Design a protein around this ligand. Structure first.
Ligand SMILES: *[C@@H]1O[C@H](CO)[C@@H](O)[C@H](O)[C@H]1NC(C)=O
Ligand SMILES: *[C@@H]1O[C@H](CO)[C@@H](O)[C@H](O)[C@H]1NC(C)=O
Ligand SMILES: *[C@@H]1O[C@H](CO)[C@@H](O)[C@H](O)[C@H]1NC(C)=O
Ligand SMILES: *[C@@H]1O[C@H](CO)[C@@H](O)[C@H](O)[C@H]1NC(C)=O
Ligand SMILES: *[C@@H]1O[C@H](CO)[C@@H](O)[C@H](O)[C@H]1NC(C)=O
Ligand SMILES: *[C@@H]1O[C@H](CO)[C@@H](O)[C@H](O)[C@H]1NC(C)=O
Ligand SMILES: *[C@@H]1O[C@H](CO)[C@@H](O)[C@H](O)[C@H]1NC(C)=O
Ligand SMILES: *[C@@H]1O[C@H](CO)[C@@H](O)[C@H](O)[C@H]1NC(C)=O
Ligand SMILES: *[C@@H]1O[C@H](CO)[C@@H](O)[C@H](O)[C@H]1NC(C)=O
Ligand SMILES: *[C@@H]1O[C@H](CO)[C@@H](O)[C@H](O)[C@H]1NC(C)=O
Ligand SMILES: *[C@@H]1O[C@H](CO)[C@@H](O)[C@H](O)[C@H]1NC(C)=O
Ligand SMILES: *[C@@H]1O[C@H](CO)[C@@H](O)[C@H](O)[C@H]1NC(C)=O
Ligand SMILES: *[C@@H]1O[C@H](CO)[C@@H](O)[C@H](O)[C@H]1NC(C)=O
Ligand SMILES: *[C@@H]1O[C@H](CO)[C@@H](O)[C@H](O)[C@H]1NC(C)=O
Lengths: 203, 673, 203, 673
């Protein structure tokens, strides 16, 4: 009155599958929650470890009967999907990141600290608050050069670059137009002297 | 009267006929040819990677100085002190690259193809094969591409792969220090052209990636009779050169288990219907017309350059001014751009930001800072909506005139890649316009039209049909695309031949080389081959004297290289030529002993008779070939011409009904039509 | 004191993202739960529709600011992943499927109804209970021919085929060995007659 | 004495020289050749798709009857009443397919290549080009492949694409109903071989997918002098045939925007290191040896078949017995298999289940029920661990002997695909063994060795080097793999030439065709070209009489086709041949009017002199060619042979010192060495 394993599994492995279920649903929930501002990397770092740990535990019988039972191996697909999303985001995180976040928080508070059209306001004060931030950003690309480096840092710098240009007209004045016309029209004047002077040296 | 021909016939004597009996008594004469055709490809692949490794490191040194210079002269004062720096950096390299050519020897000027499809034809152009020409050409194309000029590097691989073909085949190194006693039996012609054919088909494969195109190139120029063994060695020498270029560059970059980058230029991986077959024909006519504008006004320039600037002091200055204008026009054209795009991937090698928002980068600084090959690959494979169609217009309309004004200079570089880039530029610009007037669902992808504009522009500039269809089929790695490309290049020749000649043919006709080409004109079909000869013949009987042959060689008013022998009024019993004759006078063979090897001594150069000071008689039997290729009179010219060309002949001899010599047909007589 | 949309979103779109979160976490949970026996197609059919509906609602401003805000568009990736898993399983469901399920339930009850080694038991009774099931299965492949047809049906037939062969030795006896030796050794005997008879006709 | 040669020289007369002046006075003679070379490819692509559409529907009708028969004679009584059904179904098709060949004409037997690389060579084999041969061959390869035999279908595409080449080029249809007055000026030879060369290079591309391989094939056999225009039409006629085969089959299957399936066989898409370059050489030696076992015992069979079974009544019975044994061995070999696998994808076209668990399917029924091309593609591209290595052993050891015993039958099919399948079989079986003794990390993928066993086996069976390396490079769509394949086929020739000759050469030597091949033996280098001639010459003076030329034509003891004219003791003033001579005797041109066209009348066949009943004299000037290609004596044979072969010559004439005819060199004299 008992087929061994083919219709039903033992009640010694089903709680493992329910535990992986409880992990994966909540991981998808936290991962989904981050919106336009991306805080997923910095908020779903603890519960990403547990899912992987659970997968390793299941992997370590009760591994042939539970992920080589059929086509459409759904546990391997979910795990694989999480692994793929994690690698392309490329978190690798934390002190430097924390410092950058603090700077971003500070830099952003000075905008509404000096806010109130007429965007020609006292924002010259935020100039030295702005530029060094971007300078640090370039230095951070020199640190992770030896591709996108993260997603918290990229979006945080993206928001500042979107605010700095296309809603606050913060353009830089230009000083040099007449020298880069004079030098260019002087250098483009030597061939019409050269060929015409070599033509008239036939006597 | 300066370009003397090449002897491809082996004038069998009794000495040759005895020496070949001696060497045949374990058949070790042909197994020594496969060694030369093996290590004639390795030595070409190593030159082709030595250029490529050096030029990208020097370009990486030169461009990062400039992009670090105009990142600090922004945000502050003027940019003109960086424009002067980029002008003088483009002048300082091309100064040396033009001095080492305009003073030492002018033969290395231009590309290498018109001086090597005339040697292949049988005309020994002065110098050319000397080591010094190799050293100055392979060190003149490095110093000019990084110099900053609109010139390709895959041009001079054919000539540089042909010089090392006829230098290790001899085993002499005639500069000094003979370096071998090995590789006799090859110190003659009929081996010289057989190894230059295997050298020049190892530079076409090593620069494009097509081994089976190289053999068709070397055959197309080499119109000899078909022998399977020689083609089966040219194919073996061609297949090596695209394997010792993968295996060195793949050691250089990364892991050895990735055998991509098949040559110096690498088209990517690569779907059409019948309903757009007329559209491609409508491209090819355009590819003729603009081609016949590129190939015409250059002509009106080049005779000007040959009329007034014919001295080494001026053309160096003129190359320096071409480099400075090429700098300044590009800097003005990127200074005034308004189109800026966010970066992605590796589409920009050196990203330049000036007068643009943060994060975004100027798009006009692309296609000036990176190499032409990477820009041509990017024009084939970018997804749609990636180029602003005002950028490509001002880029093509400048780069066309710069590539026209740069070619014909006294520097050493090719003209292939500045034709593919122009062709892909207006091909993609034409492919965008088929999307802004239809919906452009599937069949209006610009990746097709950027290919078949680049195939059209080559046929418009360099009329080359059979050996170019194959190398456009092999580098694209797709045999479905072989049918429209053939249909494009077929059009762009027969539209362009109405107006003006080829680009490689003007630089042959403007140096008065004879250069007889395959087939004969059908309007001159009935010339009957007695009009086309020299009517008096200064032949010499066998065994008269010595003073007769001395006074027939030493004569200022006429230079003749071949003399037929007669008997009794005349019989045409074979012919003797000057080289053998002054070899016999350098020794004393007067009838009053030597093997075949004596004739070979001082083979490359034969001493003139004025140094052969000081009767009796000499017997010219067993030193002449007893059977020249003779023709009668009364024969049609097409038949006479085919026979002369299809075999390799320097001295055709016409006869009478009773076998009497009545005229001698040489190469310059057939060439004039 | 208010940047418009770049650091934060309005509170008119965040509840939509939270609703999609609540949908997607529970969909992953139910989808993950099916084990070796695959009941996912027949248990997660209702709540698969709602996720799609929510996606359409979000898609139908508040579509540029919410899924074209960054690289790693995570809402599009989750939705895309669900769509991909759904299509390859290829449910397309329901009356025929229900009938098949009922047959499977019936067929399987007769095994333990007749169970009790010694698998030479009264299982001849289940022979006509078995074969027609497989016959129906083949007929079902004739219905969805104009590739795998489902995952509930495939696994349900897979379990029966695993039980029928490699744990219950239910092989069929063979009757024909001597005719397929006699006919074969007769046909392989005519060339050695033919060549030898054509050789001896030389007189 | 039966196979008379082909005239490739145009014997220019005064009539030809006046008619070509007449036609030249808007240059509309060459633009009429491009039309024939255009619609010579469309008509070959349509034959190549007409075979492919019919044979898969008839195979789909034939195999589903059998797999529905042995699904009901399982679970019940015997299977022998289905074995008899599959034996009689494989006998009933090949009965008709052997009757329509063994009785009407034996020329369509075997493949088509050895009867077409002798015509290409210049030997007019009897019949061959007639429409009836086309109709029986293209309806004999359909009825034999579906008949059930181990024979390929890509063999007879060359001959079937060559017959329609020389049938629409004439515009005559000599059966009846002349069907045109168009396409005169082509009713002669020197156009016949120029269009058979464009036909045979349109069957190699339309059967393999390689257009640039077809031109090298037609050149390799066609060893004439190189002219660019003719090759540039053979390439244009080859490129059409792989486009009107995609465009018809893609309409047939599905959407027209998928231009895959480039020919009748389709290799897939397709990484190696230097460290396994010796290993591939160690395959090629094996590819010689087994090749020289396939190519040897067949010889010991074929003379047996020519000694006792030389009559049409017996070979029909013998083909029927080959088909019945081919059925019964396959049924015994799938009846006793123990290896069963679960199905996946489309790896089995007709899945067979007998004596296996439910759901799983027999794996030995693969590679008997599906086509050979699909099995060869599956052997190139399957992932590792997919074949049981006992299945491939018993499959190869049976299929080798069946493909050896089947070839040489009186049915019409090729031998290409039953060489690639054997080569890929033991190549993958050798590639598995490099994985069960190492870890086989990356470099021991069996997809490489299954390729380079199939390339080795062709070079072992059919010695073909230059035109086969290219068609293995183009069908694999990868130019990185061009270097080991060339290194394999080079080995498997020079190992196999030690033992036995080619497969296509035994079926030429066993019919006593002359067949002079390119180059000459180096051991016979000094024959001096006076030994190799016929010493008395039955030449005829111009304008003697009529009874002289009648008694020199009408003679049983000797058949001569060419006669040189003499004067005064002799002068060799040109030669007259039999066709023109009996044309002049069919009219009355005795000196006691006509254009060039009169000679062309009844061109294919010339009436014998016994029907030309019934003095005066006729003037043979303005009917002869005034300049034959003559050679003197005293000349080396290599030179004489090259000249004879490289141009197309039927009658070389040797002369004296004073231009007197002393001998005539024809083709059968040079062929004997
Ligand atoms: C999921 O985990 C939480 C937290 O440990 C626990 O409170 C809850 O009971 C679990 N639910 C399930 C279904 O296992
Ligand atoms: C693995 O599962 C077992 C049994 O449920 C549990 O006792 C253990 O803590 C788990 N270990 C890990 C690393 O998750
Ligand atoms: C049937 O179950 C077996 C047991 O592992 C599995 O390998 C196979 O993929 C299953 N087949 C189907 C159609 O689900
Ligand atoms: C992802 O897969 C890779 C390769 O198997 C493995 O090295 C890595 O640990 C995985 N990471 C996660 C987060 O599962
Ligand atoms: C982070 O820690 C690393 C390693 O100790 C140290 O090199 C670096 O200076 C730290 N950076 C910050 C921002 O504290
Ligand atoms: C930003 O700074 C404020 C004020 O100190 C603090 O309340 C808040 O938590 C900070 N937020 C972040 C993201 O660091
Ligand atoms: C902008 O603000 C400045 C500083 O408060 C003030 O001086 C000026 O009048 C304002 N201009 C406009 C256009 O409101
Ligand atoms: C999710 O939906 C359930 C059922 O409607 C509801 O009870 C619950 O409050 C929701 N939770 C969230 C976080 O929206
Ligand atoms: C869409 O969202 C709105 C606002 O939350 C809600 O009122 C409506 O019911 C939703 N409609 C659908 C089809 O989900
Ligand atoms: C920055 O934001 C823009 C706005 O849409 C987005 O298009 C872009 O992908 C973002 N870039 C990065 C690096 O996240
Ligand atoms: C999946 O995507 C396809 C193609 O866009 C669409 O037709 C279909 O409705 C989608 N299905 C689901 C379940 O989202
Ligand atoms: C299911 O419904 C379809 C359509 O009405 C009908 O054709 C079929 O017979 C039904 N099948 C079953 C098992 O009820
Ligand atoms: C199987 O039948 C039993 C008894 O009628 C019933 O209790 C159960 O719900 C059925 N299960 C399925 C999966 O239909
Ligand atoms: C198997 O069961 C049958 C039926 O109950 C019984 O007759 C027989 O003795 C049993 N055999 C064994 C080996 O237990």
């Amino acid at each position: 009155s008992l087929p061994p394993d083919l219709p039903d599994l033992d009640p010694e492995c089903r709680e493992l599958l329910l535990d992986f279920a409880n992990s994966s649903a909540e991981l998808t929930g936290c991962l989904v929650r981050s919106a336009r501002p991306v805080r997923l990397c910095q908020t779903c770092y603890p519960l990403f470890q547990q899912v992987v740990s659970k997968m390793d535990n299941i992997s370590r019988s009760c591994a042939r009967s539970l992920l080589m039972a059929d086509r459409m191996q759904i546990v391997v697909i979910l795990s694989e999907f999480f692994n793929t999303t994690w690698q392309e985001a490329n978190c690798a995180n934390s002190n430097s990141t924390v410092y950058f976040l603090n700077l971003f928080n500070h830099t952003l508070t000075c905008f509404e600290h000096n806010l109130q059209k007429n965007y020609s306001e006292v924002c010259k004060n935020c100039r030295e608050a702005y530029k060094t931030l971007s300078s640090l950003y370039s230095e951070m690309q020199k640190m992770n050069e030896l591709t996108h480096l993260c997603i918290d840092v990229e979006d945080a710098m993206n928001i500042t670059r979107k605010l700095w240009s296309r809603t606050f007209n913060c353009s830089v004045p230009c000083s040099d137009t007449v020298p880069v016309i004079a030098v260019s029209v002087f250098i483009l004047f030597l061939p019409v002297v050269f060929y015409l002077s070599s033509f008239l040296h036939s006597e | 009267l300066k370009y003397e021909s090449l002897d491809y016939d082996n004038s069998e004597n009794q000495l040759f006929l005895e020496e070949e009996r001696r060497i045949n008594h374990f058949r070790t004469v042909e197994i020594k040819r496969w060694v030369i055709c093996a290590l004639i490809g390795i030595l070409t692949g190593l030159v082709a990677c030595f250029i490529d490794i050096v030029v990208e490191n020097l370009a990486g040194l030169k461009y990062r100085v400039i992009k670090g210079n105009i990142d600090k002269f922004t945000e502050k004062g003027g940019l003109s002190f960086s424009l002067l720096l980029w002008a003088t950096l483009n002048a300082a390299f091309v100064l040396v690259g033009s001095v080492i050519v305009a003073f030492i020897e002018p033969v290395a000027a231009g590309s290498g193809i018109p001086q090597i499809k005339c040697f292949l034809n049988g005309v020994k152009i002065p110098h050319v094969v000397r080591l010094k020409t190799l050293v100055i050409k392979v060190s003149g194309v490095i110093l000019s591409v990084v110099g900053g000029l609109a010139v390709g590097k895959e041009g001079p691989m054919i000539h540089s792969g042909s010089v090392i073909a006829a230098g290790i085949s001899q085993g002499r190194s005639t500069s000094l220090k003979r370096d071998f006693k090995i590789f006799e039996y090859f110190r003659r012609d009929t081996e010289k052209r057989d190894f230059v054919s295997a050298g020049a088909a190892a530079g076409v494969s090593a620069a494009f990636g097509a081994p089976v195109g190289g053999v068709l190139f070397s055959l197309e120029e080499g119109a000899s009779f078909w022998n399977q063994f020689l083609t089966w060695r040219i194919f073996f020498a061609s297949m090596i050169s695209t394997f010792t270029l993968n295996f060195v560059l793949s050691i250089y970059h990364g892991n050895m288990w990735d055998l991509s980058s098949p040559g110096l230029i690498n088209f990517g991986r690569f779907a059409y219907t019948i309903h757009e077959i007329p559209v491609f024909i409508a491209m090819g006519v355009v590819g003729g017309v603009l081609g016949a504008v590129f190939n015409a006004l250059n002509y009106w320039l080049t005779m000007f350059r040959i009329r007034y600037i014919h001295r080494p002091c001026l053309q160096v200055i003129e190359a320096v001014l071409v480099a400075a204008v090429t700098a300044t026009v590009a800097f003005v054209l990127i200074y005034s751009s308004r189109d800026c795009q966010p970066l992605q991937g590796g589409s920009m090698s050196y990203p330049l930001q000036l007068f643009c928002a943060d994060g975004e980068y100027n798009s006009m600084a692309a296609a000036f800072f990176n190499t032409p090959e990477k820009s041509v690959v990017s024009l084939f494979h970018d997804p749609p909506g990636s180029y602003n169609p005002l950028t490509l217009g001002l880029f093509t309309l400048v780069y066309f005139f710069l590539a026209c004004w740069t070619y014909g200079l006294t520097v050493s570089a090719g003209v292939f890649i500045p034709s593919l880039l122009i062709g892909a530029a207006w091909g993609r610009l034409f492919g965008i316009s088929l999307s802004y007037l239809t919906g452009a669902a599937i069949w209006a992808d610009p990746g097709k039209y950027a290919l078949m504009g680049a195939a059209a522009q080559l046929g418009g500039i360099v009329r080359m049909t059979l050996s170019l269809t194959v190398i456009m089929m092999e580098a694209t790695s797709n045999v479905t695309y072989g049918f429209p490309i053939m249909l494009v290049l077929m059009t762009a020749k027969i539209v362009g031949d109405v107006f003006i000649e080829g680009l490689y043919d003007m630089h042959i006709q403007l140096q008065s080389v004879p250069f007889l080409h395959w087939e004969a004109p059908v309007t001159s079909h009935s010339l009957t081959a007695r009009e086309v000869m020299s009517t008096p013949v200064t032949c010499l009987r066998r065994r008269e004297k010595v003073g007769v042959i001395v006074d027939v060689l030493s004569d200022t008013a006429s230079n003749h290289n071949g003399f037929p022998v007669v008997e009794h009024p005349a019989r045409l019993q074979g012919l003797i030529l000057r080289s053998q004759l002054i070899v016999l006078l350098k020794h004393k063979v007067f009838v009053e002993r030597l093997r075949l090897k004596d004739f070979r001594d001082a083979y490359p150069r034969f001493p003139p008779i004025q140094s052969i000071h000081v009767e009796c008689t000499m017997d010219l039997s067993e030193f002449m070939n007893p059977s020249p290729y003779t023709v009668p009179q009364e024969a049609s010219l097409p038949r006479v011409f085919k026979l002369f060309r299809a075999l390799g002949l320097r001295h055709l001899v016409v006869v009478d009904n009773r076998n009497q010599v009545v005229g001698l047909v040489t190469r310059k007589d057939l060439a004039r039509y």
